[PDB]
Design a protein around this ligand. Structure first.
Ligand SMILES: CCCCCCCCCCCCCCCCCC(=O)OC[C@H](COP(=O)(O)OCCN)OC(=O)CCCCCCCCCCCCCCCCC
Lengths: 89, 80
């Protein structure tokens, strides 16, 4: 949470990234989300909902893998898919 | 000494694969399994089958030759 707060406020520095954030916010959300609302949504995050959302999006999901280079020892899809869950939960 | 990472030198080769949860385990099993099996058996039947055919002929001939070897010769007990 502290790293995310630092990332958001330090990214919103200078006229160019602020204008960039305004353009993306009006195109995507339809409104400019202020930093106080971002801080509220950050401080409502705790450990339980983080592991709930991570289990919703990471656990037992089929990934997309893209490799380039000497990638022979890069494991194939069964090993990565089996590494996407634990037998001990 | 011989593991993944140092097996072969491969350049410019792209592989595409999908998840087993994304695709069927039996994609057109019968409709493409039957012609593939027919193609394999017609490419190998002339090399495989005729030795076993002549084994069957030799087996039947040997069994029937043993059976008529145990048969009584009618030429004996004809003089008296
Ligand atoms: C001249 C070939 C003419 C073929 C005409 C058929 C059509 C061909 C064109 C259309 C394609 C059809 C499908 C093709 C499938 C694969 C190709 C194929 O079958 O080729 C013919 C095959 C290989 O030919 P090749 O090895 O060059 O012949 C040398 C023969 N010694 O050769 C064969 O399959 C022939 C196998 C003959 C085996 C005879 C064995 C006799 C002796 C058996 C003894 C067993 C033990 C006996 C007891 C011993 C103790 C007492």
């Amino acid at each position: 949470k502290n790293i995310l707060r630092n990332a958001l406020v330090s990214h919103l520095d200078g006229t160019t990234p602020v204008c960039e954030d305004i353009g993306r916010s009006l195109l995507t959300y339809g409104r400019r989300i202020p930093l106080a609302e971002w801080e509220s949504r950050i401080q409502e995050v705790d450990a339980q909902m983080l592991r709930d959302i991570c289990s919703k999006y990471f656990y037992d999901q089929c990934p997309a893998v893209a490799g380039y280079g000497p990638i022979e020892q890069l494991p194939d899809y069964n090993r990565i898919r089996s590494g996407m869950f634990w037998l001990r939960f | 000494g011989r593991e993944f990472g140092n097996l072969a030198r491969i350049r410019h080769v792209i592989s595409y694969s999908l998840s087993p949860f994304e695709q069927r385990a039996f994609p057109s099993y019968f409709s493409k399994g039957i012609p593939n099996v027919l193609r394999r058996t017609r490419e190998r039947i002339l090399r495989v089958a005729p030795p076993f055919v002549v084994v069957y002929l030799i087996y039947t001939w040997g069994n029937q030759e043993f059976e008529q070897s145990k048969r009584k010769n009618p030429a004996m007990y004809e003089n008296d």
